[PDB]
């Protein structure tokens, strides 16, 4: 066999690598993603089902699939579960009775042998009043430090200032990709 | 030679039952 | 990539119960294990071979993601193959059709006329209980359109949502006022129906 | 045959 | 197409005829009525030709009835081809005239018969014995007149074994359709030259030589151990038919034996072999073989006693072989392999088929009914079965668990907390009366007896008329034994079941309730919460009338129906 | 006892059909179709059909059902064994058994037929009887058949006289889920394929337990079989009388004895399969095959099939002896090997997902089969002591024989 | 409204299936083969209209595939069996010559134009021009 072709692509780029958008409802993450794909912040209804969007970084075409925090879109997370490579969690340091839940959530979505290769992916949502936690409350509560064979970085990023998503963008591809 | 073993030569009787 | 005409002929071709059964198990095996690398380029002549198979009597359990996956596409065709399975495998009883609210949501504002006549045909087609409930609003919006080609659409809409959540016809009241002297025969008889269902 | 025939013949 | 097949067949070119005669053969093949040619081909009916005269006796035979006038203008045809030097051509001729349904056409041809009678050639002596059943069968005065019963009695004595097999059997076939006046019974000397010839018979000549010795009566011991020696060999033949026969016809002359002498026990001993190579044979055959064995089973049971791994269903063997093999381990099952039943039955009860899954429950019930050693395995097996979340699964666990409550409550206490809480919203009628039932009867061990009776009491008054008078049954126990939790139940059942209940018999059972309380509640536990008696189970045996008359019909269409033979014909 | 013996078609049509007693009406063929149709919807489906007071009993065929309708309580074993007999002559004088031969052998079919059986009762059933008188391409009828020695035509002559033998071994193994085997049962098989000069009336010999019992010889390792079936023309009175087995052999291959007894011994193949199967995520095909055959026996063509799950896709293969394919169709995954030697211990790892979707209803746990075939082996240590071959005329005869071991109902219950 | 419309051929076979009532896969199966059973078990004189499990079966074939209509006991026969002609019309205009063989490799073109026609079971297009043009519309979307 003959590998050309393939040095040839890789030669001008050709990795893509994957994502997830989940986390609890009004945490950010369809924002999160919007501001991923289009770069503005857009109101738009709830998210029932569940939203597809690729970005384009670094020459790798980044694909999220936003998920909804809803009751009835929660369960529906397992089907995005089959062919995924990443998985983005989404916390609202802003919602503290919603907080628990989240942590919930996202126990239960790692919890999981089928997702296993994706690394955790927290993003600290609703980084624009004075309530929101630091880069380590947030962490230390949901404990992502105790999370093991689990690469979870901690990142703040605010859906209306747009500041730190190119951080968790940044971990997220040299999570995924490992070369130079 | 022939798959499921190989044909052997068959005797006549007991030679030693007389 | 196997085309729809081509997994006809196949079946066709065979005559024997067994014989069928196993071409049509190894037709939907290729096509399991092309949906999970998430292909995306024959996605139509998958979806066009799952719909000929469940409908010749086979199981499609496996074939519920790629069309929800498609639904939300932004191909014409894969599109309308998503909407095609939408309403022949997705039932309110199936359970796979909770996702698809956003995707209807989503598409109930395209600008197409086809996209979105589409997905107010399968709405109507599939219409569920917790469906309409999240869709009547949208229903109304488009009843008060002056569109002929959409009119009869929102009507058709309103009568299934009326049908499923007899609740819900409290809104669509005033949207119906003043509305008999539409010249287009479909519009006139949509108003007709939605009235005498009301 | 039977099927390609037309089903009015028009 | 027509009018040019009827040109063909009229010419004088042989090629031509045969061509004619082809497509005639294949039109009636498939699917045309070629009857209105058949006056046409009665002129190109004497050819020299074999192949020709061979497709013009099919259609005369074919077309006979269609168009008797029309066969006249063959007797002296069908005479002539008689005396044809040929044996192949005589036999043809033979065959063909008894195949010909024609009332005025057996009548002409009686002397043909008879001349065919004395055929010295084996083929066409055994052609001519055909022919003279045939037209037997179809006119028994007319066989009777031509006196052609002598010659088949005496083609038995005969060389030609397998054409005095052929009149053997033909021979029983006039006696079977006969009244039995002037049987044709044989002595002794008769069954042993039959048994002599029967070595040299063919595989078809062997089954008539057998069906003969099946209506024989044996009447001294000497005589029956010579008929069990003969028979002996014929176990060892490659023909399930043959098999069948002899073992047949060994359970009929064991009816004379004496248990006393070893022939006997050497007869058991060899009918098993025989028995595991039949349950190996092909799956035609193997539900005949499964209801020989059923039917010599209730007449021998020692025979299969050690048969216990052959009865397990293969995951390759048929529905009906499944079946059949489930109910042979029924029939068999015994204490030495109530474990193998235990774990085939549990085995069986994984498979997808609803009536197998079913099936295999009814049998585990029945065996655990019929042998108390294995109650306690059994209602284990039950208990999971209804912990494996299957509706049909719980269902049959839960009609089983009924099943021996009624015929083993003794011990049957320890079940009930487990079945208290046993998904019990199954709306099946028979899961449904059954726990209702376990419930009035059992309404000791559940300290929620009452709670639980109230969730079927409200729709009691609709539910069933079966179902409601176990459900005011149950009412009645739990008010009898705990009236004070029950006090308002009682009331409520009886007016739901005397106002609101316009069944008759359900009414009456209500009513004489609200009768029993209202005069002595006393009196109404030792009435109503009576001790009963022990449950007689239905035997599965047959009548030991029909056992014996089911022995001599072995091999018959009566024997897989499990049937009276004369209960089963038109 | 049947009324008349046709042969039907898969889309119902009758191939072909032939009255032999006239007491059913030929138009009750149709209602077959329908009531069959309505058996297997519900269940009731059986061999022997009954339509009112006639009984249609059909065999199913390679491509159309011999259905046999009977009217009176005839012979059900009788009308098997024809059918039987039957399909076998078809077979030899047909290579194939479908459609394309029962619509081109019409002429000699039909002549087949009415010679075969008439007024019910069969008359001739051997092949080289039949062929020997009735042929696709007439005299008077062999004397063969009108004369005691029906399976052996005399007359024949060739230029050596050579027999080649067949000691066919099936090893079937009951194995339940649980680890035991419950049903292991191997039957023999003694298959000649005589080819000489006239009717040599063959003198079969071999070290079975009861002859060496009554010779005094019983010491040895002999072969008890617990069923033991003769060919035709294997002579019964012999065989039960002394256990001679002398039988004139017959002109082609043919099944002289079929051994048929228990087995005792470990199995052949030990297969012990781990279903790591996750809850709709993947799933795990711990396959291990042992040999517990000799080590100087080598399992040729051995083909362990494990079922895999019914809507499983993308599966991987981490075996390290025998290539493993996964057929669609099949709907399991089969260890082939191309060469088994005894003793070998082959490990496999299977892994594949599953879909997102839970099925509907569930399919089952198939028995876990193996294709595995030794040559030259003989596990139940039979050796054939002789075979006496004596002819009238006079001739040294060079009979041959082979052992082959197979695997028959060698199936392991599922997990 | 119909309640469920399939095209079945007259050997069994079904060309077309479009059932407006969310029913269970066995359930629905069940009820096309019983549907299919009394088509094929009803002659040429039986009116075109059966009574089955109290909705207007009406079966009418103009060709060897058949096609059966369910609905409801509210409106008159005759306006389904005008539908269903209306729709046979349309589908040979928009097809040409349509035969047993085009229906087959036409599967998802004949479930566009029976959405495009009628959905839900109510009729959505009453001219037969107007929906040929938004059919040939779509189609040339691509
Ligand atoms: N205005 C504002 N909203 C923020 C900010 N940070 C996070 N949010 C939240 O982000 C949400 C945006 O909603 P969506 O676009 O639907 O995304 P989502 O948060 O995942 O909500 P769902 O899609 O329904 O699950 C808002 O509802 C806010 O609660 C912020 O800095 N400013
Ligand atoms: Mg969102």
Redesign the pocket.
Known sequence: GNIFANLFKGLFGKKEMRILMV?L???????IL?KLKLGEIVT?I??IGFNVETVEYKNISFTVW?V???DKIRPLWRHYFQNTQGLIF?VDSNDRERVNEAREELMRMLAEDELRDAVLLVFA????LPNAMNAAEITDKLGLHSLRHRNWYIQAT???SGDGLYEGLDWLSNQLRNQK | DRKGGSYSQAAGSDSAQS | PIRLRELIRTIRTARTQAEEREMIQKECAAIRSSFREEDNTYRCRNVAKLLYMHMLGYPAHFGQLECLKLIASQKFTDKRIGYLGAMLLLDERQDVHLLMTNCIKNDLNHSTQFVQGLALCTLGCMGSSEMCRDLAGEVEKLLKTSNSYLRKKAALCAVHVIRKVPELMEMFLPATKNLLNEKNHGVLHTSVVLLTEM | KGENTSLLHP | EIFELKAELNSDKKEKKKEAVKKVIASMTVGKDVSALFPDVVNCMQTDNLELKKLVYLYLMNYAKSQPDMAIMAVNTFVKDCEDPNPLIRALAVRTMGCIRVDKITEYLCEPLRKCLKDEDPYVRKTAAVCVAKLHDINAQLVEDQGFLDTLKDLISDSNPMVVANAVAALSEIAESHPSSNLLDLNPQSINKLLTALNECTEWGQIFILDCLANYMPKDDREAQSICERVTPRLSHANSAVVLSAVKVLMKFMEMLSKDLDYYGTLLKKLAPPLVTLLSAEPELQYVALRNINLIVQKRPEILKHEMKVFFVKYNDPIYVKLEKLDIMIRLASQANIAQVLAELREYATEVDVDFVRKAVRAIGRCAIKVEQSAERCVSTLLDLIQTKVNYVVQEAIVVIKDIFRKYPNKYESVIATLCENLDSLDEPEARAAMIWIVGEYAERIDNADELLESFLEGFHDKSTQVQLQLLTAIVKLFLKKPTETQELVQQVLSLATQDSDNPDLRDRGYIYWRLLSTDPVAAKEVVLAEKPLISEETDLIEPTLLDELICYIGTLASVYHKPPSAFVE | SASAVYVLDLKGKVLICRNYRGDVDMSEVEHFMPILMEKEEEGMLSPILAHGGVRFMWIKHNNLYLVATSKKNACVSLVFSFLYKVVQVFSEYFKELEEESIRDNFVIIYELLDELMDFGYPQTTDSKILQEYITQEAPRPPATVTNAVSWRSEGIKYRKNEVFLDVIEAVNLLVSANGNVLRSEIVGSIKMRVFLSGMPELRLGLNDKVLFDNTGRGKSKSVELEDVKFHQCVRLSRFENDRTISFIPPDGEFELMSYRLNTHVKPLIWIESVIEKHSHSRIEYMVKAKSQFKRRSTANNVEIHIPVPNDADSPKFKTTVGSVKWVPENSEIVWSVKSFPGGKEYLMRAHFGLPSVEAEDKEGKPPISVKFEIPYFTTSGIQVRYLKIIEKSGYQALPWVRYITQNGDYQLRTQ | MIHFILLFSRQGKLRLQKWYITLPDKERKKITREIVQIILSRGHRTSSFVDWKELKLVYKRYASLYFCCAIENQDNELLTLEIVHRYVELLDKYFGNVCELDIIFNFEKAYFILDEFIIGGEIQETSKKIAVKAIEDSDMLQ
């Open positions: 986390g409802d009004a945490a950010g993450k369809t924002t919007y738009t709830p998210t936003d909804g925090g809803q989404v949502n609703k980084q624009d605010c859906a209306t």
